[PDB]
Amino acid sequence: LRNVQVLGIDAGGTMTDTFFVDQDGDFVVGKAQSTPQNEALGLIASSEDGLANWGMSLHEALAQLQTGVYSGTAMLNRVVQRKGLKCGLIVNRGMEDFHRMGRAVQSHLGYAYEDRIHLNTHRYDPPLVPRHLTRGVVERTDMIGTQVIPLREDTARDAARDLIAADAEGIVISLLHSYKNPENERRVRDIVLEEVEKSGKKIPVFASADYYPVRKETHRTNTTILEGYAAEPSRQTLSKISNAFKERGTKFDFRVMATHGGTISWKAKELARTIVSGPIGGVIGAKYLGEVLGYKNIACSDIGGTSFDVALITQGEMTIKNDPDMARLVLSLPLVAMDSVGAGAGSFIRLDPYTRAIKLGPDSAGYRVGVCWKESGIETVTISDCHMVLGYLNPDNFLGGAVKLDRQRSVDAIKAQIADPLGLSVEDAAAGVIELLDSDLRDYLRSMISGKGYSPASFVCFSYGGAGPVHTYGYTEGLGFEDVIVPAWAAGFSAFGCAAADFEYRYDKSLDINMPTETPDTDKEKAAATLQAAWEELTKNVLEEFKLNGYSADQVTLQPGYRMQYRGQLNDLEIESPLAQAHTAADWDQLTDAFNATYGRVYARSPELGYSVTGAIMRGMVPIPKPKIPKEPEEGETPPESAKIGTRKFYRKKRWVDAQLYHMESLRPGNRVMGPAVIESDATTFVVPDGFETWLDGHRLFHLREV
Amino acid sequence: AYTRSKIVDLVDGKIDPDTLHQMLSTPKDPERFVTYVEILQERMPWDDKIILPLGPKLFIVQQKVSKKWTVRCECGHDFCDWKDNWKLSARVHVRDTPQKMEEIYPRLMAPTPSWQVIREYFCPECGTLHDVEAPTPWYPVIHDFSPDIEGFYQEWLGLPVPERADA
Numbered sequence A: 001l002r003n004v005q006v007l008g009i010d011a012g013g014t015m016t017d018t019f020f021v022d023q024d025g026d027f028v029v030g031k032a033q034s035t036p037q038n039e040a041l042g043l044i045a046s047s048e049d050g051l052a053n054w055g056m057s058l059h060e061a062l063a064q065l066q067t068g069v070y071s072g073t074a075m076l077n078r079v080v081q082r083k084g085l086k087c088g089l090i091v092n093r094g095m096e097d098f099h100r101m102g103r104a105v106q107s108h109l110g111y112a113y114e115d116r117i118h119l120n121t122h123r124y125d126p127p128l129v130p131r132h133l134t135r136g137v138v139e140r141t142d143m144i145g146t147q148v149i150p151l152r153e154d155t156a157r158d159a160a161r162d163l164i165a166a167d168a169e170g171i172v173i174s175l176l177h178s179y180k181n182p183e184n185e186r187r188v189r190d191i192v193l194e195e196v197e198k199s200g201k202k203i204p205v206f207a208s209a210d211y212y213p214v215r216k217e218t219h220r221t222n223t224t225i226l227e228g229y230a231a232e233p234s235r236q237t238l239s240k241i242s243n244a245f246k247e248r249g250t251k252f253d254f255r256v257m258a259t260h261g262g263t264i265s266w267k268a269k270e271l272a273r274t275i276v277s278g279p280i281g282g283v284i285g286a287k288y289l290g291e292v293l294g295y296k297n298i299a300c301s302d303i304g305g306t307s308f309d310v311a312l313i314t315q316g317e318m319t320i321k322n323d324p325d326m327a328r329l330v331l332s333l334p335l336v337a338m339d340s341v342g343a344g345a346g347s348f349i350r351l352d353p354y355t356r357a358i359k360l361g362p363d364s365a366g367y368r369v370g371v372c373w374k375e376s377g378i379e380t381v382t383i384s385d386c387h388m389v390l391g392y393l394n395p396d397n398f399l400g401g402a403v404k405l406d407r408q409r410s411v412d413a414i415k416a417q418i419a420d421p422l423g424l425s426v427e428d429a430a431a432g433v434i435e436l437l438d439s440d441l442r443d444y445l446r447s448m449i450s451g452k453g454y455s456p457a458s459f460v461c462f463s464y465g466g467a468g469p470v471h472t473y474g475y476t477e478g479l480g481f482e483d484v485i486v487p488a489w490a491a492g493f494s495a496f497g498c499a500a501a502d503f504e505y506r507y508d509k510s511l512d513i514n515m516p517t518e519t520p521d522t523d524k525e526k527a528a529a530t531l532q533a534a535w536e537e538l539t540k541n542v543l544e545e546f547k548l549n550g551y552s553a554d555q556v557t558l559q560p561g562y563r564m565q566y567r568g569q570l571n572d573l574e575i576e577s578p579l580a581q582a583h584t585a586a587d588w589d590q591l592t593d594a595f596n597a598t599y600g601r602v603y604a605r606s607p608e609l610g611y612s613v614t615g616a617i618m619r620g621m622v623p624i625p626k627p628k629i630p631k632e633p634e635e636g637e638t639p640p641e642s643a644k645i646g647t648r649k650f651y652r653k654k655r656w657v658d659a660q661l662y663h664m665e666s667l668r669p670g671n672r673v674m675g676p677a678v679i680e681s682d683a684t685t686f687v688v689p690d691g692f693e694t695w696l697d698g699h700r701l702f703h704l705r706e707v
Numbered sequence B: 001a002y003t004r005s006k007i008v009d010l011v012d013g014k015i016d017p018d019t020l021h022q023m024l025s026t027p028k029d030p031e032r033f034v035t036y037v038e039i040l041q042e043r044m045p046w047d048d049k050i051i052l053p054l055g056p057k058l059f060i061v062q063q064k065v066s067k068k069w070t071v072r073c074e075c076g077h078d079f080c081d082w083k084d085n086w087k088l089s090a091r092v093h094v095r096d097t098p099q100k101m102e103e104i105y106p107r108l109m110a111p112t113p114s115w116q117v118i119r120e121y122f123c124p125e126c127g128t129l130h131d132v133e134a135p136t137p138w139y140p141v142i143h144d145f146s147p148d149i150e151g152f153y154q155e156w157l158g159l160p161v162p163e164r165a166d167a
């Protein structure tokens, strides 16, 4: 009677999350410790935990699934732990060192403010390509493509022969301004291919113009090396992960998450886009619901055990960071933009010895939770320990009770580490920390929306993650959101979002079109031609990716795009082309109008200064089974008595209060819960203090009010 | 506090990255000095008590017999009283010519001896290099460090001051 159709995974967070959903939108969320040395184990265990809540076995469910998506640390750890091939590098003679120099910035990427200024904490990771596997060719092309120093091909043959003699398992080629004029770089590419053929050895060649033709040599060269360093090894890892499921019943090809928020095959030609590990799925999930619910402006809030992540969906679209840094590497990958606010509910709480100020993080207990877990060994209190003291969390229901927690351990550790030093009671100390955390998150949401030129009233707030529903009341209080939403599957929303993502390949190329306000048609005719030619080069890449996955062009839905701005001023939006192709001066006028329209919709305009195109975009989408959103008829306002599961005292605003406990899954659409109550699940807790109310809709989404 | 082996790795320069980052970003351990000195003590070929390390191989030591405090090289050579400047009782080699300068720097990258001179202060017995000054000509020998050992031991560490005799 039950048909499990879609599977979503997110192993990048505190642990391995799995999200299963059936033909009706009924769901379960699985949780199990991650096993990065062999991620298959944790993926199986997590799936078995989730399906157990349905009374189902893994063996029975996998045979039903018709699609599944994975996101995690497979690619990330392969880069961080430097377990890739012996890839070589060919650059411009005289600049062989610019890769391993890391542009200086890679000595302090991912550092908290205090570590960034604390010089001695700075540290270089080993270069992806060592010096002895780097060579140079004599050539220079300037910023507009003029060949200042023509390519000296004899230096390319020698470079290629040098790396082949060093038994290079890959050869990357990156010359300056090849994104502008790829003539020389692609000539070096061909010369390398020839000398490889002669040698009889199997050595793939990667030209940065063919893979990531964008400005910034450091970003671009890193991103192309990943294709020759970690791509094929990552394919092996993802083969085992997908083989583990396949040899257990799955009849589909697994897809994986990409930086740009779309899913791609794990056999893709470009797999550097799978280095993403953060919960960008959560942003894709909220957008997917907004599309169906009618919410254009959404503030996403993922409060997990290891991170506090936030993001905005403004007018249906989400922001893409184009020159991000990941794994302490500057990269040329379009990434869904999220901001980290902290180190999760496992964030350690300390008193600075010199100041006695309260410090959260930046390190986190993570899966170890806190001191309340005696067998974890954690000796330092965490935000979760404050939830134990204050009574928000059920000691006997952490992961259904799998984790043996002792609330008295939290009371004792907070008393010696925080409360007594400050002269406070244990409850006031814990409540105070939670108060500090709520203000940080509340202000960071307010400021973020204010930055886009909006007020929270124009927005809706989504609160998910295992610990999101624990703080929703606190960091949404008084902001005046149109609606505050807690999904019933909050503990696996990031995994739900991976399954909601499109099967979407994306390719980018840099441009430098400069157009005054008024110009003759010929000039407009050449601008459209430049953009059109870029679209044509990217369309090839997109359709080739799908052709390898077994999909034909007439099955792919292409959406051309470009990044445009009023000259001199930058923007954080990308425009979908109203036209599949641009040729005439009128077609160009449509593209400039599309930006003016999008700019006014999201946000002040300045058509006077002209327009600049800095990049072209091509996206190709193929329809795939997506998680069904429940749409059940709503029942009575009063929750069933079977949902009441006792009372627990929790502490808020200097008051101990008897709170009604509820079994989340037992509640029904239409039910209303009046605080003080705690709606409990096996892997998430939804706190509703007095002065707050909640109701559940047909989609199993909770709505939070202040009454 | 940190494991003794971690502090040992620190001294030997073999510590791992994650621990070294901890030591830097986390609050200092008040127990570092006591452990640090003891680690250095068991590595000396003499049992004279270290009371303040001045360098990788230079220490202020309590002489086990006279109870005087002297600056001592790791090999055992005593320079002077702890209040005096050990350099004044050492051996020096001054690079005041382009010839000498180009033995440690490439030309053009080397300082100019008429502006800056390099002084190398050695231990007379083992020839260890304990300090290198780079002043202008004529410049006095620097007395780099005059520590307040009594206040350090007594007020900051809460430890008893070692027995001291006058020189």
Ligand SMILES: Nc1ncnc2c1ncn2[C@@H]1O[C@H](COP(=O)(O)O)[C@@H](O)[C@H]1O
Pocket (backbone or CB within 6 Å): A013, A014, A015, A303, A304, A305, A306, A345, A346, A369, A384, A393, A397, A398, A399, A400, A465, A466, A467, A468, A470, A491, A681, A682, A683, A684, A685
């Ligand atoms: N019943 C629960 N069981 C386990 N963790 C919970 C529960 N309720 C809330 N959590 C919180 O959810 C966090 C994990 O969130 P996540 O990283 O999304 O899985 C934990 O650190 C807790 O603070």
Ligand SMILES: [Zn+2]
Pocket (backbone or CB within 6 Å): B073, B074, B075, B076, B077, B123, B124, B125, B126, B127, B128
């Ligand atoms: Zn000596």
